[PDB]
Design a binder for this molecule. Structure first.
Ligand SMILES: [Fe+3]
Length: 338
């Protein structure tokens, strides 16, 4: 309500595709959430603003990098013929919301390897025969000749230069993601810097800054859902999560050609447009620039998230049981700091 502004323009009036081919996507294809959003800026890679945003660790969409230019041709027939005979990780859900688990962390408290043509079949199958799948596989040597070529034509000049301009560490992985229309990756944060390169179809990316930690409520560090929000965005429990009513997001819709910089520790929620077809994305993950020699004050939001993560981990080791972390922390604050 009031101030009365319309800076809550969301991801905005949909783009017109070239050659009068109509609206890329439609508002009816968005899921409906409780909270307001402001647009990520869409910029030329040659726009000095865009270098400014990334320098400053703020999200930006670059519309013209040609990062994954040779992969625009990618689709299911072309991948099945060329991706090779490797094992691919394939996540399934009964619901539209995918929930992921750290498997080492389950001791404390569904994935399936298969070949591409099996993923395509299961997928081929469902369309003829409620079930949702999500292929998410980091890329390796098992990929065949044409994918290696495609890959070599990616814009290494551009991204190499960002790696160096920013002081980042090494490229740790590229992950291919192939999702079915309507698929949701719920809100979480990654601790690496991300260029999220869209290839086929449209994904709506809702981001929140690291200073909304208090509104988003991640699972304990030792839980298998570490780094994800406990909050169900389609049914927020305001009694448990009262500061979710103060959440403000940055949103955009990425299509083929676009690259979204997701800065390190930024929350994101990624959904594949309703009735949009399959989505394909490749991510580029880098380690951030080292922590400087001596600190500066004020601390950045992400540094205080780092600090909180490490109090929970240490307390896990000290007590000898991560289930005791919470009782000690409560005993520490109650009637003392709250
Ligand atoms: Fe992520």
């Amino acid at each position: 309500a009031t101030a009365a502004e319309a800076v809550a323009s969301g991801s905005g009036e949909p783009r017109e595709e070239a050659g009068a081919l109509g609206p890329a996507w439609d508002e009816s294809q968005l899921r409906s959430y409780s909270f307001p959003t402001r647009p990520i800026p869409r910029l030329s890679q040659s726009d000095p603003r865009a270098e400014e945003l990334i320098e400053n660790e703020e999200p930006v969409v670059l519309t013209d990098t040609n990062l994954v230019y040779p992969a625009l041709k990618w689709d299911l027939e072309y991948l099945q013929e060329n991706i090779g005979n490797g094992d691919f990780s394939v996540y399934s859900a009964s619901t539209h919301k995918f929930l992921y688990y750290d498997e080492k962390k389950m001791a404390n408290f569904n994935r399936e390897e298969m070949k591409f043509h099996e993923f395509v079949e299961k997928l081929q199958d469902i369309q003829q025969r409620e079930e949702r799948l999500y292929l998410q596989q980091t890329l390796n040597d098992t990929v065949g000749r044409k994918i290696v070529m495609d890959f070599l034509g990616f814009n290494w000049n551009w991204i190499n230069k960002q790696q160096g301009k920013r002081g980042w560490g090494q490229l740790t992985s590229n992950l291919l993601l192939i999702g079915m229309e309507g698929n949701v990756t719920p809100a979480h944060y990654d601790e690496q810097q991300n260029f999220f390169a869209q290839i086929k179809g449209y994904k709506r990316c809702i981001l929140f800054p690291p200073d909304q930690f208090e509104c988003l409520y991640p699972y304990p560090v030792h839980h298998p859902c570490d780094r994800q929000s406990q909050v169900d965005f389609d049914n927020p429990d305001y009694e448990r999560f009262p500061n979710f009513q103060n959440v403000v997001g940055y949103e955009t819709v990425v299509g083929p050609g676009d690259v979204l910089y997701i800065p390190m520790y930024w929350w994101h929620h990624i959904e594949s447009l309703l009735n949009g077809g399959i989505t394909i994305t490749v991510n580029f993950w880098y380690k951030g620039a080292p922590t400087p020699k001596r600190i500066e004050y004020p601390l950045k939001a992400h540094q205080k998230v780092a600090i909180m993560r490490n109090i929970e981990k240490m307390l896990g080791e000290a007590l000898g049981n991560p289930q005791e972390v919470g009782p000690l922390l409560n005993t520490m604050i109650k009637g003392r700091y709250n």
